[PDB]
Design a protein around this ligand. Structure first.
Ligand SMILES: [Co+2]
Ligand SMILES: [Co+2]
Ligand SMILES: [Co+2]
Ligand SMILES: [Co+2]
Ligand SMILES: [Co+2]
Ligand SMILES: [Co+2]
Lengths: 326, 326, 326
C-alpha cells in the first residue's frame, strides 16, 4: 500500500471525539504483528518501544470532528450538535454517514431550492435519513449515535491529497509507519507512540495520558493550518513544519532547536512557523519539553483539507531520526 | 541603588513569554552571592530558603507582554502576532526593540499622517527596521524573534513610577529584596521564591512549578489593576493590596485573614479588593491555600503603567513579615 | 559631531508653536561664533549673508506640534488643547514632558486596561503628573504651560533616523550647516536664513517675516510626507525632493526648473512630487518666486517620523549650491 492508499483507508473510517473505536481497531489490526500495545480507560492506544527511562512520547489523535445526534423529530429527522470546530457554512447541503450500533446509514442535510441569502446555523439544521415519522427513525437511529461527512478522496496534480480527516489520520499513518520501521532497532530509553482520543474537544485523551506518562520529550504529530500572513513563509511542499507557537502554547525553544539540527544533519528539508489552534503536546507543557510537528494543511477542517505527499514522507523520516538521535 | 533604579534596571530588560533568558540571567547575577538557585526545564528560577516542610511559596513572573515576529514581508517589514494581552490602540506609531540572536535592533511601527478614524488592528500592522527587501531583513531578523516597546521611564511628582514592565518586574525586585533580607535569618520550614515564566500566556511557568512543589501557602506577587467601580476603595498610596478575587480565582479567605492580621500587627497599612485578570497563585488552587499580594497599578499593560513607591516599600516589609510569622 | 547626534540634540529640545525659546537659544549658541543675527518681535531668528539685493530666503521652522495646558482638574490632572495637527490616536497611553517656567516635569496620558475599541478624543484625555489635588498640581504647573511627547530616537539599519521633531529640526540643522559652509565665501546679493516660529499653526512667523523681507526667491526647507499614491515615485533614499505642489500652493514652476538644473549640474540626485500640507514658502507667494525643498519623511507628525540620512546629506549640498548659483 502506497501512502495515498493508507491515507484513503484511515480517513474513511468514521470516529468522532469519544467515538474512536473503529480507528483504534484498525490501528490494532496492523500494529499487532509488530508490537504489543494497551488501551486506556479513556481509549488511547499506546505502543512502547525500547526500555528504561521514558525519553520521547509521540501523539497523533484518532478523533475527527463531526455531528452528535441529540434527538429525533416528529417528522423523523435527526437533530444534532457539532463536535469539535466546524464552520456552519460546511454543514449545508451535504451527504453524511450516520453511524449506529447496528451499522452505517446514508443521511442527507438538505438545502432549500431557488425554485421554492444567509448562513443557516447548525441548530436550525437536521439530518434526513428517509424516515417518515419519529417511530420509524428511532428504529434506525438513537440519540447519542453520531454522524460524519461522506468523504470524497482526491489527488491534485499527482502531489496533493484532499479529503476530510487528514487531520489527523495523516498523523496516525505516520506513527504506524514509524512503529514498523523502528520495532527491530535498539533504542535508547523508551520511545512511546500514542494514538489519542478526544483531541478535538480539549485534548482529553492527551491529558489522561499525562498522568501515567512522564516523557523527557513530548511531541504532537498534527496539522499546521496554512497559509496566511500569520503563517509567514510556510508552504505546502517545502517539508514538515515545526509548529513553534500556536494558541495553546509557546512550545520548547530548546526542543525546536534540537529537532531543526537533527533534520539538517539528515538532509531533511524542514520549516518552522506560527499558527492557530492547539495540540496534545500542550497537555504535557506541565512536565516535559514539548513541541508539535506537522505537515502544513490547507482548508483545514473541511471536506477539502489538503496536504502535500512529500511533506508527509519527510515527516516520517524526521520522526524516525528523532527516535534515534534526540 | 535606590528602588527607582532597581525598578528601571529590571524593567529595561526585554523578555516576553517563553523568552525570559535575559531577565533570569540578571536575577541570578543579583542573587548569586546570597543563595543557591535552580532552573526548571521550562525556565522557572527557584530559590529555597530554610529546611523542612514547604511552608510558603512566593511567585513573581519574569515575562512581559510583547510581540512575536511571525514573518517577513516582500518589502522587508516584520509581520507579528501579540503575546499576552495588548490593546491594539497601543501598537500604533511606536518605537520597538526587536530582539534577535545576534543582538538588539531598533524598529518602528508606523502611523499614517493626515497629509496622505478607527483603531488599526494588530494583523494590519508591521514593524519597519530599515530593510529594503525581504532578503536584507532576513539577514537581520528571523521569524520567532521577538519585539518589545522602547521604554520611557517617568517619575511622577517624587512618588510614582511609570514604565512598561512594572508588571511584573516590581514583583521581581520585591522578591529579590526579600531574599537578601531573609537569607541571614533562621525561619523554618522552607520558604520558596520562584521567578516564573509564561505567566502572561496562561500561567504556564506556575503550572509546571506546581508539579514539583506542594506548599502549605502559595502567593503570587503581581499587579492589581486600579482603579474603577470594580476596585472599590483601593487607591495608589494606601499600601499593598490583598488581591482577594479576580477572574482566575476566589482565593483563600482564611489566608487573607492571616495576612491581614500579620499586616496590622506589624503596623503595615494594607488594602483588600476585587480586580480583573489572573495570577500564578491560581495554578496552586488545586493543592495549596492561595492568595495574590499586589501593589495597585494604574494604566496596566501599557507604556505608562504606574505604581506608588511607598506601596512597594510596604509590600517588601509585608512579604518578610509573612516569612517570619505566617 | 555626527549628523545623527545633531538631529538628536535638536529634536530633543522642547518647543511648541509660540514657545520656541529653547530652540532659538540653541541655534543662537551654534552660530554665535559664525555670523550676526537678529530676532524679530514674533520670535523668528534671522541670519543675513552677503550684501546688496535680497536674492534668496531660506526658511526652516523651530516649532513642533504639541499640547497646551488649558486647566487643572479637581483631582489634579492637566487638561489640554492640541497645537498643530496631531492624530488623536497618538495621544493615548504616552509619556510627555510638561514644560513650565520652573522646569520640566514628567507626565503621562493614561490608558484603560482590559482588566477594568474606539479612538478616545483629545478633549476626553488628561495628563497625570502625580499631583493629589488641584492645589498641589497648581504649585507644579499652570494653564498656558505646554507639553510635548517624550522622544525615543531610533536608527534603522544604520541609514534611517526616527524620532518626533525631524519636522522641522532637520531643516534647522540643514540651515545651520549651510550657514557655516557659506560664511567664508562671497555671495551675490544677500542670502537670508530664517528659523521661523509658529509654522504649525498657519505660518505666522513666516507671515511676519514677509513684511520685513522681499526676496526674489523664497525657499521653505521642510518635510515632504511620503509615501502614498499621491506622492508618485518619491521614495526615501532617492534624494532631496522638490515639493512642487501641496495643499497650501502650486509653487513656482520656473523656480523648480532652476533648482532641478543646478542640482543636475552638481550631480546631486533629486526628486519632485506632490504631497499634502503647507509650508512657510506659501507666505511669500504674495511677492516672490516660491518653492519648498525637502527630504521625504515617513510617518509624519508622530513619534516615529523617519528620514534617510543621505537625503539630508544631499539637501545640504543642494542648498549651498543654490546660494552660489541660483
Ligand atoms: Co488535529
Ligand atoms: Co483538528
Ligand atoms: Co500582566
Ligand atoms: Co502580572
Ligand atoms: Co509639521
Ligand atoms: Co514642518
Amino acid at each position: 500500500m502506497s501512502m495515498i492508499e493508507k491515507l484513503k483507508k484511515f480517513t474513511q473510517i468514521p470516529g468522532i471525539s469519544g467515538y474512536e473505536e473503529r480507528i483504534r481497531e484498525e490501528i490494532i489490526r496492523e500494529i499487532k504483528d509488530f508490537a504489543d500495545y494497551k488501551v486506556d480507560a479513556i481509549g488511547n492506544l499506546i505502543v512502547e518501544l525500547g526500555e528504561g527511562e521514558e525519553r520521547i512520547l509521540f501523539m497523533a489523535h484518532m478523533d475527527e470532528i463531526g455531528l452528535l445526534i441529540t434527538g429525533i423529530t416528529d417528522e423523523g429527522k435527526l437533530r444534532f450538535r457539532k463536535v469539535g470546530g466546524i464552520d456552519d457554512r460546511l454543514l449545508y447541503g451535504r451527504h453524511v454517514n450516520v453511524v449506529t450500533e447496528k451499522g452505517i446509514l446514508d443521511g442527507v442535510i438538505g438545502a432549500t431550492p431557488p425554485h421554492l441569502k444567509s448562513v443557516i446555523p447548525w441548530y436550525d439544521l437536521v439530518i434526513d435519513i428517509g424516515a417518515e415519522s419519529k417511530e420509524e427513525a428511532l428504529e434506525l437511529v438513537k440519540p447519542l449515535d453520531f454522524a460524519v461527512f461522506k468523504k470524497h478522496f482526491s489527488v491534485l496534480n499527482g502531489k496533493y491529497v484532499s479529503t476530510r480527516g487528514l487531520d489527523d489520520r495523516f498523523g496516525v499513518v505516520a506513527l504506524i509507519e514509524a512503529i514498523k520501521d523502528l520495532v527491530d532497532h535498539e533504542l535508547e530509553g523508551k520511545v512511546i507512540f500514542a494514538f489519542t482520543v478526544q483531541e478535538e474537544v480539549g485534548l482529553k485523551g492527551a491529558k489522561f495520558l499525562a498522568n501515567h506518562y512522564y516523557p523527557q520529550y513530548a511531541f504532537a504529530i498534527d496539522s499546521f493550518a496554512c497559509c496566511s500572513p500569520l503563517t509567514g513563509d510556510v508552504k505546502l511542499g517545502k517539508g514538515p513544519v515545526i509548529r513553534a507557537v500556536d494558541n495553546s502554547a509557546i512550545y520548547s525553544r530548546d526542543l525546536a532547536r534540537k529537532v531543526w539540527s537533527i533534520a539538517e544533519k539528515n538532509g531533511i528539508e524542514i520549516q518552522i512557523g506560527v499558527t492557530g489552534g492547539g495540540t496534545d503536546a500542550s497537555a504535557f507543557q506541565d512536565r516535559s519539553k514539548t513541541l508539535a510537528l506537522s505537515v502544513p494543511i490547507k482548508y483545514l477542517h473541511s471536506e477539502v483539507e489538503t496536504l502535500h505527499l512529500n511533506d508527509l514522507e519527510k515527516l516520517v523520516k524526521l520522526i524516525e531520526a528523532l527516535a534515534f538521535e534526540l
